[PDB]
């Protein structure tokens, strides 16, 4: 209860809107702050389109191997590994790395492509267990995060628990569980959001996100010092559109709950 407090003063302290879901599955408990609303997911979204292609990938086990191809007209807004590989091909697993670890937004498209637009992405989530996640729009749009509007959202309660079932659980296959993880923990995108609220010797694997309206989120698994793991997702907005990031906040949260 004095954890809601803290985060409560927080949220107002930033003039924003805060949601935080923490699992800690030393003793399956949850700390929860504002976890049943909707936030926009921004690039945090690009967990479940590489979890996708993971799981299609237990099927078909050449898959991370197939071969995509780059073209000029694939480029978007921000896309810092495809943009060296235009007029060539990158292999799914190339396209997942640059996914999870540079947020390269054509990396996104060509896994939503591959899986079958948004609302396969979508209907995978269902497969899972988590009824409120919805992948509506592709990049660049995706990140519009417009205050009311439910596209492209999840609530930080349904992502803790789907995050804690794609790495901690069994929702995929070990050798793809696996897999994900060395994704995540190898993310270069991340230290100055929840990693900068947590001891060094801790490790994270994070997926961060930003768009508009000033929108800073971040998920994370994380593996404290001679602990069970913990489930962390920090997702923050604010009221103006053109409102700067925010990762201090996250940062602030982090610390908030694991202390
Ligand atoms: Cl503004
Ligand atoms: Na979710």
Request: aromatic share 4%; with cysteine.
């Given at each position: 209860?004095?954890?809601?407090?803290?985060?409560?003063?927080?949220?107002?302290?930033?003039?924003?809107?805060?949601?935080?879901?923490?699992?800690?599955?030393?003793?399956?408990?949850?700390?929860?702050?504002?976890?049943?609303?909707?936030?926009?997911?921004?690039?945090?979204?690009?967990?479940?389109?590489?979890?996708?292609?993971?799981?299609?990938?237990?099927?078909?086990?050449?898959?991370?191997?197939?071969?995509?191809?780059?073209?000029?007209?694939?480029?978007?807004?921000?896309?810092?590994?495809?943009?060296?590989?235009?007029?060539?091909?990158?292999?799914?697993?190339?396209?997942?790395?640059?996914?999870?670890?540079?947020?390269?937004?054509?990396?996104?498209?060509?896994?939503?492509?591959?899986?079958?637009?948004?609302?396969?992405?979508?209907?995978?989530?269902?497969?899972?267990?988590?009824?409120?996640?919805?992948?509506?729009?592709?990049?660049?749009?995706?990140?519009?995060?417009?205050?009311?509007?439910?596209?492209?959202?999840?609530?930080?309660?349904?992502?803790?628990?789907?995050?804690?079932?794609?790495?901690?659980?069994?929702?995929?296959?070990?050798?793809?569980?696996?897999?994900?993880?060395?994704?995540?923990?190898?993310?270069?995108?991340?230290?100055?959001?929840?990693?900068?609220?947590?001891?060094?010797?801790?490790?994270?694997?994070?997926?961060?996100?930003?768009?508009?309206?000033?929108?800073?989120?971040?998920?994370?698994?994380?593996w404290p010092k001679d602990r069970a793991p913990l489930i962390l997702?920090?997702?923050?907005?604010?009221?103006?559109?053109?409102?700067?990031?925010?990762?201090?906040?996250?940062?602030?949260?982090?610390?908030?709950?694991?202390?």
């Open positions: 209860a004095d954890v809601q407090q803290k985060l409560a003063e927080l949220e107002r302290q930033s003039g924003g809107r805060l949601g935080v879901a923490l699992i800690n599955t030393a003793d399956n408990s949850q700390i929860l702050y504002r976890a049943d609303e909707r936030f926009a997911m921004c690039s945090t979204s690009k967990v479940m389109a590489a979890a996708a292609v993971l799981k299609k990938s237990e099927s078909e086990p050449n898959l991370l191997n197939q071969r995509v191809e780059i073209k000029k007209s694939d480029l978007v807004n921000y896309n810092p590994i495809a943009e060296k590989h235009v007029n060539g091909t990158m292999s799914l697993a190339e396209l997942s790395a640059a996914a999870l670890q540079y947020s390269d937004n054509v990396a996104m498209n060509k896994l939503i492509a591959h899986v079958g637009g948004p609302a396969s992405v979508t209907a995978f989530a269902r497969q899972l267990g988590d009824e409120t996640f919805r992948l509506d729009r592709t990049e660049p749009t995706l990140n519009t995060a417009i205050p009311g509007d439910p596209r492209d959202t999840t609530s930080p309660r349904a992502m803790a628990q789907t995050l804690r079932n794609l790495t901690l659980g069994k929702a995929l296959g070990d050798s793809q569980r696996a897999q994900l993880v060395t994704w995540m923990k190898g993310n270069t995108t991340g230290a100055a959001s929840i990693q900068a609220g947590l001891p060094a010797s801790w490790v994270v694997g994070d997926k961060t996100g930003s768009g508009g309206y000033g929108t800073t989120n971040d998920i994370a698994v994380i997702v920090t997702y923050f907005t604010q009221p103006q559109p053109k409102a700067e990031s925010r990762r201090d906040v996250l940062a602030s949260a982090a610390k908030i709950v694991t202390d």
